[PDB]
Amino acid sequence: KKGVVHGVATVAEKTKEQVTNVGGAVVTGVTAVAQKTVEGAGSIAAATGFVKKDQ
Amino acid sequence: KKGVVHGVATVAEKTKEQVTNVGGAVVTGVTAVAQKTVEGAGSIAAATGFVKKDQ
Amino acid sequence: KKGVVHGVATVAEKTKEQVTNVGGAVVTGVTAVAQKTVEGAGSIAAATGFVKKDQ
Amino acid sequence: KKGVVHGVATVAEKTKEQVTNVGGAVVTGVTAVAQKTVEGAGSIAAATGFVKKDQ
Amino acid sequence: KKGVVHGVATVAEKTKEQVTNVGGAVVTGVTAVAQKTVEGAGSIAAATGFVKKDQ
Amino acid sequence: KKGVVHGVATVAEKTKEQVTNVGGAVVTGVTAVAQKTVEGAGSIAAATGFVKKDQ
Amino acid sequence: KKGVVHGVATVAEKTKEQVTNVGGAVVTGVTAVAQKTVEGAGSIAAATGFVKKDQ
Amino acid sequence: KKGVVHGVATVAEKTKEQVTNVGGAVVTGVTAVAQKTVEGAGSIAAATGFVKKDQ
Amino acid sequence: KKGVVHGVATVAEKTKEQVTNVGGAVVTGVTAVAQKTVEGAGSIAAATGFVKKDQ
Amino acid sequence: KKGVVHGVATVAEKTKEQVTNVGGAVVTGVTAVAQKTVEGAGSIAAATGFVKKDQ
Ligand SMILES: O=C(O)Cc1cc(-c2ccc(C(=O)O)s2)sc1-c1ccc(-c2sc(-c3ccc(C(=O)O)s3)cc2CC(=O)O)s1
Ligand SMILES: O=C(O)Cc1cc(-c2ccc(C(=O)O)s2)sc1-c1ccc(-c2sc(-c3ccc(C(=O)O)s3)cc2CC(=O)O)s1
Ligand SMILES: O=C(O)Cc1cc(-c2ccc(C(=O)O)s2)sc1-c1ccc(-c2sc(-c3ccc(C(=O)O)s3)cc2CC(=O)O)s1
Ligand SMILES: O=C(O)Cc1cc(-c2ccc(C(=O)O)s2)sc1-c1ccc(-c2sc(-c3ccc(C(=O)O)s3)cc2CC(=O)O)s1
């Protein structure tokens, strides 16, 4: 076989899960957050996949 | 087989799940948030997939 | 087989779920949010798939 | 088989769900929000798929 | 088989659900929002699929 | 102060919420159920406050 | 002060929430159930407060 | 002070929450269940407060 | 002070939370269950407070 | 002071949390369960407070 990509690719066979991202956010997984009190200014309480590039 | 992509591709066979994103947000997964009190200015309480690029 | 894409594609066979996004938001998954009090100015309380690019 | 796309495509066979988006928003999934009080100016209380690009 | 698209297409067989969007909004999924009080100026209380590109 | 009750009482001051029940059911709280398919014979799908005393 | 009860009482001061139950069910709290498929005969899918005394 | 109870009492001062139960079920707390597939005959999927006394 | 109870009592002062139960179930706490697939006959998947006295 | 109980009592002062139980189940605490696949016949997957007295 032959393949040429510029990116971003994701090429496969017999594949149970696939995610391609440029951005941005993708949530595909099981996630449970239980929480009782959030205070403070300002605290990232429960972050799973996170990116902060403030300018 | 032969394939040429510019991106972003996601090419496969026999594949249970697929996500392609440029952006942007995609939520495809099970997610449960239970929460009782959020305060503060300003706190990211429960973030799963998150991207902040303020300018 | 043969395939040429410019992107964004999502090409497959025998595939249970598919999402293609450029944007933008796509919500296809099970999601439960239970919440009792949100305060503060301004706090992202419960974000699942999120993108903030304010200029 | 043969396929050439410019994007955004989503090509498949035997496929239970499909979403193609350029925009924009698509909501196809089960979603339950129960909520008791929202205050503050201005707090994104419960966001599932979200994109904010204010200029 | 043979297929050439400009996008946005969504081509399939044996497929339970399909959405194609350029825009715009599409709501096809089960959604329950129960809510008791919304205040503040101005807070996105419960957003499922959302896109804000104010200029 | 003085108080004598036989029950069921609920005596208070400065009190935001009150429920007295003998029975029977009382629903006073925020509740959101979103649901897509219920089958089976016979399955309690989503029960919040529940009592079954079949004889 | 003086108090004599037979039960069930609930006596208080300065009290934000109160529930008295003999029965029976009382739902006063925030609750969100999101659900996609229930099968089987017969399975209690999502039970929060539950009592089964079949005879 | 003086108090004589037969039960079940709940006597207090300056008290934020109170529950008295004989039964029966009481749900006063924040609860989020997100769920995608329930099968089997018969499986208690997600039980929070639960009592089964079948005879 | 003086107190005589038969039970079940719960006597206090300056008390943030109180639960009295004979039964039965009481759910007052924050709880988040996220779940993707339940099978089998019959498996208690996610039980928090649970009592099974089948006869 | 003087106190005589038959049980079950719970007598206190200046007390943040209280639970009295005869039964039965009481859930007052923060709890997060995230889960992806449950199989088998029959396996207690995730049990926090649990009692099984089958006869
Ligand atoms: O609002 C728009 O104008 C954006 C926009 C509008 C579209 C419309 C389609 C139909 C429309 C109609 O019909 O009206 S409008 S598509 C689209 C975008 C796609 C991808 C974008 C990306 S991808 C990326 C990075 C990738 C990798 C990085 C690293 O590694 O740093 S950064 C940034 C951006 C943007 C940014 O600068 O934030 S914007
Ligand atoms: O970068 C920041 O400064 C903003 C910022 C920064 C935070 C940090 C947290 C931890 C940090 C650390 O630890 O470093 S930083 S939270 C936060 C914001 C929350 C909500 C905002 C809203 S909500 C809204 C509208 C809602 C409804 C409208 C209608 O109807 O028009 S407009 C606008 C905005 C903003 C705007 O465009 O003005 S900004
Ligand atoms: O003790 C057991 O055997 C029962 C049992 C044992 C399990 C184990 C799991 C792991 C174990 C291990 O690892 O050891 S054991 S799960 C389970 C049951 C689930 C649901 C049941 C239902 S649901 C229902 C009705 C619903 C609706 C009705 C209407 O409308 O009348 S009646 C009745 C029953 C039962 C009945 O009274 O018959 S029993
Ligand atoms: O259905 C009923 O008949 C029971 C029932 C019915 C009532 C009604 C009220 C108004 C009604 C109307 O108006 O119609 S009916 S109250 C009540 C019960 C309270 C407490 C009970 C307990 S407490 C306990 C244990 C405590 C500790 C143990 C260890 O350590 O082993 S076991 C068991 C039981 C029961 C059991 O054997 O399962 S049952």
PDB file of N, CA and C in Angstrom, chain B residues 2-23:
ATOM      1  N   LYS B   2      -4.369   2.914  -2.053  1.00  0.00           N
ATOM      2  CA  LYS B   2      -3.639   4.164  -2.177  1.00  0.00           C
ATOM      3  C   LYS B   2      -4.461   5.281  -1.555  1.00  0.00           C
ATOM      4  N   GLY B   3      -3.787   6.184  -0.851  1.00  0.00           N
ATOM      5  CA  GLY B   3      -4.447   7.325  -0.259  1.00  0.00           C
ATOM      6  C   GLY B   3      -3.531   8.522  -0.135  1.00  0.00           C
ATOM      7  N   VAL B   4      -4.026   9.696  -0.509  1.00  0.00           N
ATOM      8  CA  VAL B   4      -3.294  10.948  -0.344  1.00  0.00           C
ATOM      9  C   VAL B   4      -4.234  11.946   0.307  1.00  0.00           C
ATOM     10  N   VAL B   5      -3.826  12.525   1.433  1.00  0.00           N
ATOM     11  CA  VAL B   5      -4.694  13.456   2.138  1.00  0.00           C
ATOM     12  C   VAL B   5      -3.946  14.771   2.303  1.00  0.00           C
ATOM     13  N   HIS B   6      -4.702  15.849   2.475  1.00  0.00           N
ATOM     14  CA  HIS B   6      -4.143  17.106   2.955  1.00  0.00           C
ATOM     15  C   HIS B   6      -4.334  17.273   4.449  1.00  0.00           C
ATOM     16  N   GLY B   7      -5.268  16.558   5.032  1.00  0.00           N
ATOM     17  CA  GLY B   7      -5.494  16.774   6.437  1.00  0.00           C
ATOM     18  C   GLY B   7      -6.507  17.870   6.684  1.00  0.00           C
ATOM     19  N   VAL B   8      -7.405  17.618   7.631  1.00  0.00           N
ATOM     20  CA  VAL B   8      -7.291  16.487   8.528  1.00  0.00           C
ATOM     21  C   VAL B   8      -8.198  15.327   8.075  1.00  0.00           C
ATOM     22  N   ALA B   9      -7.618  14.173   7.811  1.00  0.00           N
ATOM     23  CA  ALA B   9      -8.437  13.025   7.461  1.00  0.00           C
ATOM     24  C   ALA B   9      -8.592  12.098   8.655  1.00  0.00           C
ATOM     25  N   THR B  10      -9.422  11.072   8.477  1.00  0.00           N
ATOM     26  CA  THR B  10      -9.488   9.934   9.394  1.00  0.00           C
ATOM     27  C   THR B  10     -10.033   8.761   8.593  1.00  0.00           C
ATOM     28  N   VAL B  11      -9.160   7.877   8.151  1.00  0.00           N
ATOM     29  CA  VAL B  11      -9.518   6.850   7.185  1.00  0.00           C
ATOM     30  C   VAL B  11      -9.355   5.507   7.866  1.00  0.00           C
ATOM     31  N   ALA B  12     -10.284   4.587   7.626  1.00  0.00           N
ATOM     32  CA  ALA B  12     -10.338   3.388   8.445  1.00  0.00           C
ATOM     33  C   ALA B  12     -11.158   2.305   7.772  1.00  0.00           C
ATOM     34  N   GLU B  13     -11.241   1.168   8.454  1.00  0.00           N
ATOM     35  CA  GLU B  13     -12.167   0.097   8.145  1.00  0.00           C
ATOM     36  C   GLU B  13     -12.517  -0.612   9.445  1.00  0.00           C
ATOM     37  N   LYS B  14     -13.752  -1.134   9.527  1.00  0.00           N
ATOM     38  CA  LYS B  14     -14.240  -1.962  10.640  1.00  0.00           C
ATOM     39  C   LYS B  14     -14.170  -1.226  11.970  1.00  0.00           C
ATOM     40  N   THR B  15     -14.591   0.025  11.962  1.00  0.00           N
ATOM     41  CA  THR B  15     -14.224   0.955  13.011  1.00  0.00           C
ATOM     42  C   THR B  15     -15.399   1.399  13.853  1.00  0.00           C
ATOM     43  N   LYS B  16     -15.335   1.197  15.162  1.00  0.00           N
ATOM     44  CA  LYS B  16     -16.549   1.440  15.934  1.00  0.00           C
ATOM     45  C   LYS B  16     -16.835   2.926  16.122  1.00  0.00           C
ATOM     46  N   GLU B  17     -15.837   3.758  16.392  1.00  0.00           N
ATOM     47  CA  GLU B  17     -16.118   5.176  16.582  1.00  0.00           C
ATOM     48  C   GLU B  17     -15.107   6.014  15.816  1.00  0.00           C
ATOM     49  N   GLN B  18     -15.542   7.190  15.363  1.00  0.00           N
ATOM     50  CA  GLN B  18     -14.714   8.121  14.608  1.00  0.00           C
ATOM     51  C   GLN B  18     -15.104   9.540  14.934  1.00  0.00           C
ATOM     52  N   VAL B  19     -14.113  10.392  15.134  1.00  0.00           N
ATOM     53  CA  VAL B  19     -14.320  11.821  15.337  1.00  0.00           C
ATOM     54  C   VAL B  19     -13.257  12.546  14.533  1.00  0.00           C
ATOM     55  N   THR B  20     -13.664  13.552  13.778  1.00  0.00           N
ATOM     56  CA  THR B  20     -12.740  14.452  13.114  1.00  0.00           C
ATOM     57  C   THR B  20     -13.101  15.856  13.524  1.00  0.00           C
ATOM     58  N   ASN B  21     -12.128  16.622  13.966  1.00  0.00           N
ATOM     59  CA  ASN B  21     -12.458  17.945  14.450  1.00  0.00           C
ATOM     60  C   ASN B  21     -11.412  18.915  13.939  1.00  0.00           C
ATOM     61  N   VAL B  22     -11.871  20.108  13.587  1.00  0.00           N
ATOM     62  CA  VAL B  22     -11.061  21.301  13.426  1.00  0.00           C
ATOM     63  C   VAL B  22     -11.900  22.390  14.041  1.00  0.00           C
ATOM     64  N   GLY B  23     -11.500  22.970  15.162  1.00  0.00           N
ATOM     65  CA  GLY B  23     -12.347  24.002  15.730  1.00  0.00           C
ATOM     66  C   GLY B  23     -12.024  24.419  17.141  1.00  0.00           C
TER      67      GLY B  23
END
